[PDB]
Design a protein around this ligand. Structure first.
Ligand code: CL
Length: 107
């Protein structure tokens, strides 16, 4: 009924204050269409997971569903996890992304 976990998110772009995060839809949507996703972040120095958007994320980019996470702090290390939403509710989280630091990218 609930959807399965989305794929492990990947950071596709970063700046000092943002990261473009992308993930694949779950293999099992639970039997009803997924209507959107929640994305949460966790930083170094805190155990908590925090939603990064006020409304569900739906944008499909080149590699998966994606969102540019704002309000990151330069030099801080973050991970992200995504949850799918369907008619039954919010599914379990993806595996967390590999850690990434907010900073500008290697040229
Ligand atoms: Cl980089």
């Amino acid at each position: 009924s609930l959807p399965g976990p989305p794929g492990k998110p990947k950071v596709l772009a970063r700046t000092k204050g943002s990261m473009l995060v992308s993930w694949t839809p779950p293999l099992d949507n639970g039997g009803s269409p997924i209507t959107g996703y929640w994305l949460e972040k966790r930083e170094e120095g805190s155990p908590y997971w925090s939603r990064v958007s006020r409304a569900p994320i739906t944008k499909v980019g080149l590699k998966g569903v994606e969102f540019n996470v704002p309000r990151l702090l330069e030099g801080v290390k973050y991970q992200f996890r995504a949850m799918a939403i369907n008619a039954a509710g919010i599914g379990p989280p993806s595996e967390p992304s590999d850690p990434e630091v907010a900073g500008d990218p290697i040229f």
